[PDB]
């Protein structure tokens, strides 16, 4: 039996054309999240409903819907029900929903839950919006000069979960199949050796990369680049850059500048002339250290992406508080993109700061601009009043600490 | 017929019992190198010559021998010879050689030639040691905390080059194969899909791991760290992660520290503990930044390797001055790991910093660390003498702007 409660008030968000319709009481589903879910997991419903009461003077609110995977889904579910049905069932029919961070158990054999709420529920879009907040403590000497935008691939590359364990029946019938029916003679040590599949399709790609550049146009971005390791794998992550650059002819108009490769797009709104670029991925990670004013909106694969989101983060101070999105045509899950810290759970300490982001990137999903348009302000004035959690303030000087739920707080207060 | 000069004076280095014999008057095979060759690869010649000159007081001499690779070979061998047998044949029988920077052709469906290289002469290990040189400028705030050497697996991985073109007799078969016989039910698009085979073997894996250990204890460095995204890719990546602990506690008397996974290898010269631990790959490229001192041996595979060379590069103003070196057990390739530069070849301009430190690996790999010493020496001198070229001249202040071969003799000068 369902131990979800579907509120009394509350009205569910439909979809029709293509386009969001969101009622003054929507319905959200929310995952609390394992380990430090318990701390961050408050203050984001706190700030969230904070910005929501202030920018719509008590018109709107949102009736939040606790559902369950992870830990403590099998603590409310029984025993090995680390994902029920249900909750791949709500999140498509409520449309819009966020989660704090997973546990995926280890020794069950079973694949990461956050890959497979993306891939059940075909959130093909992984949207990771990187940008510095001033006064936050950075290992870098310019990270304001980081504003980037990252469309990573999210249903398909190795990230299928398509392989087979060394010296497994399997593996040894699709290495035989390989070398024998294909005449692969590429394979180094064919004993004991694992086997992995890269898959990448024209319509995985192109749905992604089409996202990328509608949202450059919408957002008026000057730069959609291609990253890709397409030298040495040619017909996935190459081929991932050519239909990236085809698409951009095919339906944007793109057009060739001087020589090529890159491309020219105009933005049909404002006439403003966005970049198609492509650069190869080890490349890609220099140049965002050296070169960061130059990149905008990012569209890669799922592993570069999952690598890029990350390294970015890290290098604008953001690595506890880089806002995530996993976008489909028919729901959206928001998350914390940090892990469970199980080390600091209930302890009040860690910072909000991601899953509040995320649950920006939520409310602007839902067209609720001016309420995220508030945490924006909330987080970057609590940020400059230096007023912050334990892992900025060991980085800085002359700062105050807070708790987590204080943090939350201090967001509110400079709303 | 060949157009290899073997030198009048000069002798063949031998290998017996796994080490190397190296005459006074070794022959040295080079490549000049395509692009930018042209002008890094003579500023190598001279200092290395004048490093061995000064070591060991013109007892000893490298008798440097070109050899051929890239569109010079076609410009010597014809018009298809882009690697010519007799340059396999030629670094194999003289165990030691160098190469500038190499241009694969696009179009012709040709494969990276650097990768040829590696892969054809069993180079399983590329070794990528990233320090800071005093002077350097920097992106980050604190590039000195970086001292790290990288052990990257060169033969398996990705870069198999295992794949099929979407749409192609071979790829739809291959994914028939899958779908049908192994079953394979989570390739989410399977049409116009192209297709990629990722290996990861145990004698692979150890082979690569050994000789990061064993350099550590050679060293005195103070821990390795096996880099793998084993959460996602099981069998593969997990596999490497898992076999790398297995090996230093089989070989290398590992041992659990409290309650693991991390393990002590006690070092049998100095008895420094070394420690073995591990970190997820996506994590790692934020912990380069964040805690770099954590970190110094890194053991980790092909592709992971080439993407976290790359951003420790980067991170340190070593861009265009990061040395590298691919070794096997039967000969060893060094070489500069930036790309041809076609736009300055010729000028006198780039930085010869890159194939003069890989040379400065070579004089320490011939057991000449005399010689290899006084390159470190130069090197660290001209820096921080603000005698540079443009590439560190337009990052800095009060710097005095070098040509290459300019800067190839601060170095000699400051030995
Ligand atoms: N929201 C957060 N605020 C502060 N630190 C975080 C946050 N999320 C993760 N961390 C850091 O990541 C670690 C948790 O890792 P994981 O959940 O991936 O296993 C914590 O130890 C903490 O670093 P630290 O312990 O150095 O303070
Ligand atoms: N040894 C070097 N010294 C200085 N810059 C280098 C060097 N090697 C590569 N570069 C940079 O990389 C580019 C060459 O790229 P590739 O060979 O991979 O196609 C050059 O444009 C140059 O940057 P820049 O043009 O900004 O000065
Ligand atoms: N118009 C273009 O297509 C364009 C412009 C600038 C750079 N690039 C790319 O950057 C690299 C070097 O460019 P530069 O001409 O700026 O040195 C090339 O690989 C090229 O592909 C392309
Ligand atoms: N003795 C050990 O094995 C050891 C020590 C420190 C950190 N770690 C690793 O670091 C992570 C967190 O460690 P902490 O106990 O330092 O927070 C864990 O994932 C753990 O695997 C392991
Ligand atoms: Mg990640
Ligand atoms: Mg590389």
Chains 1, 2 share one sequence.
């Not at 090995?80 to 704090?100: F, K, Q």
């Not at 190459?238 to 490769?261: C, H, N, S, T, V």
């Not at 940090?338 to 920006?360: C, F, M, R, W």
């Amino acid at each position: 039996e369902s131990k979800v409660v579907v509120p009394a008030q509350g009205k569910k968000i439909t979809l029709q054309n293509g386009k969001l319709n969101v009622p003054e009481n929507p319905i959200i589903p929310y995952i609390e999240g394992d380990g430090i879910g318990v701390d961050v997991t408050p203050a984001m419903l706190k700030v969230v409903d904070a910005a929501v009461e202030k920018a719509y003077k008590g018109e709107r609110k949102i009736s939040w819907m606790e559902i369950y995977t992870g830990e403590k889904s099998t603590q409310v579910y029984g025993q090995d029900v680390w994902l029920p049905a249900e909750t791949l069932d709500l999140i498509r029919e409520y449309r819009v929903a966020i989660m704090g961070p997973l546990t995926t158990p280890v020794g069950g054999g079973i694949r990461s839950l956050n890959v497979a709420l993306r891939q059940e529920l075909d959130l093909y879009i992984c949207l990771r919006p990187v940008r510095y907040y001033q006064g936050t403590p950075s290992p870098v000497k310019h990270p304001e000069l980081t504003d980037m935008v990252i469309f990573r691939e999210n249903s398909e590359d190795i990230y299928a979960g398509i392989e087979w364990k060394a010296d497994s029946a399997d593996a040894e019938k699709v290495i035989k199949f390989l070398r024998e029916e294909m005449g692969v003679k590429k394979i180094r040590f064919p004993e004991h050796c694992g086997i992995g599949i890269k898959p990448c399709s024209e319509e995985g790609t192109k749905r992604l990369v089409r996202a990328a550049i509608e949202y450059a146009i919408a957002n008026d971005r000057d730069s959609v680049t291609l990253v890709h390791k397409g030298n040495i794998m040619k017909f996935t992550e190459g081929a991932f850059k050519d239909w990236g650059y085809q698409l951009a002819r095919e339906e944007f108009g793109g057009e060739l500048i001087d020589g090529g490769p890159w491309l020219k797009v105009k933005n049909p709104n404002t006439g403003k002339e966005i970049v198609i670029k492509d650069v190869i991925a080890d490349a890609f990670l220099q140049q965002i250290l050296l070169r960061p004013a130059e990149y905008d909106v990012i569209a890669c694969m799922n592993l570069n992406g999952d690598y890029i989101s990350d390294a970015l983060a890290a290098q604008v101070g953001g690595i506890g508080i880089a806002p995530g999105a996993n976008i489909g045509d028919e729901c959206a899950l928001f998350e914390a993109t940090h892990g469970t810290a199980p080390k600091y759970a209930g302890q009040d300490k860690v910072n909000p700061g991601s899953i509040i982001l995320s649950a920006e990137m939520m409310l602007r999903h839902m067209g609720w601009t001016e309420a995220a348009d508030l945490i924006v302000k909330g987080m970057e004035g609590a940020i400059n009043a230096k007023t912050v959690t334990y892992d900025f303030e060991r980085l800085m000087d002359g700062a105050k600490l807070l708790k987590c739920s204080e943090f939350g707080d201090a967001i509110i207060e400079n709303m």
